[PDB]
Structure 1
Amino acid sequence: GLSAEQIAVLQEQGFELRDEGWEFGMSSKVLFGNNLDRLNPDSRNTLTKIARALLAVDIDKVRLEGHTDNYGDEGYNQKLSERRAESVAAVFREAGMPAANIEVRGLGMSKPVADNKTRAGRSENRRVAIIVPAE
């Protein structure tokens, strides 16, 4: 049961509603640049800001999901996606979100959002979803 005031904050922070709840997806290019799992300093501050905004209205559970394109080793992409999700998780922990309320998954190339047949598609598949689970 999310209040209208909580929904307002999620909307202002850029979340959109999906099957699993309120989701804010950011591409890996925005989040990490040419880094591996170290966030761009700017992206990290941005994420700390989102985290504090949710917590201010007692939104204090998040699920963090990492994705890669299909290009490359499945196993490597899998670990990378997970480490990338964990980088975002750590920002939410330091921002004051309980470790038990934070869930981190690496989904590798399993859950595309765009077509791996094009270089532009693949780029969109490399991403981390911030989800606030709600039914």
Structure 2
Amino acid sequence: PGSMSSKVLFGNNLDRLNPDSRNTLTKIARALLAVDIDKVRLEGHTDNYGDEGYNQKLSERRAESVAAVFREAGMPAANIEVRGLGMSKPVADNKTRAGRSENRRVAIIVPA
């Protein structure tokens, strides 16, 4: 509901978006660029199931997946940073499937 309200959720232990989710992410990056948003930091996250090491690498791959979409959308490669926070920074409760759902994500951050 507006380009600034942009959530990017992933399936369980999936580090790539599906055709429809990737499509919807593309028009987000398209929308951001059209309003001069220009540079982004991408931070991937996971639920707290599995090993720390797996999740960290998983969250890295999620963020890189989103980075590849922004690059394809026409945003300069140098203007994109990628981080994985693994499971360290949940937005929702991991003890419910609805919460775990919300933690499987990449947060788009716009730096000054």
TM-score by length of 1: 0.70
| RMSD (Å), alpha carbons | 3.1
Asked whether the 8 Å contact 1:26–1:128 carries over to 2, the reply is: no
1:23-73 per-position Cα deviation (integer Å, ceiling 9, x unaligned): xx9999974436722311111111111111111222111111111111110
Bigger radius of gyration among the two: 1
Asked whether the 8 Å contact 2:60–2:83 carries over to 1, the reply is: yes
Asked whether the 8 Å contact 1:28–1:127 carries over to 2, the reply is: no
Asked whether the 8 Å contact 1:81–1:106 carries over to 2, the reply is: yes
Asked whether the 8 Å contact 1:27–1:127 carries over to 2, the reply is: no
Q: Secondary structure at the match of 1:26?
A: coil
Asked whether the 8 Å contact 2:10–2:105 carries over to 1, the reply is: no
Q: Tell me the matched-pair count.
A: 110
1:63-107 per-position Cα deviation (integer Å, ceiling 9, x unaligned): 111111111100000000110110011000011101111011100
Task: Call closer, same or farther: CA 1:66–1:28 in 2, change over 3 Å.
Answer: farther
Gaps in structure 2 of 5+ consecutive residues = none
Task: Call closer, same or farther: CA 1:122–1:33 in 2, change over 3 Å.
Answer: closer
Cα distance in 2 between the residues matched to 1:107 and 1:80: 10
Gaps in structure 1 of 5+ consecutive residues = 1-24
Q: Percent of aligned pairs with the same residue? A: 99
Equivalence for 2:97: 119
Deviates more, 1:69-78 or 1:116-125: 116-125
Task: Call closer, same or farther: CA 1:29–1:123 in 2, change over 3 Å.
Answer: farther
Deviates more, 1:124-133 or 1:67-76: 124-133
The answer as to 2:49 corresponding to 1:71 is yes
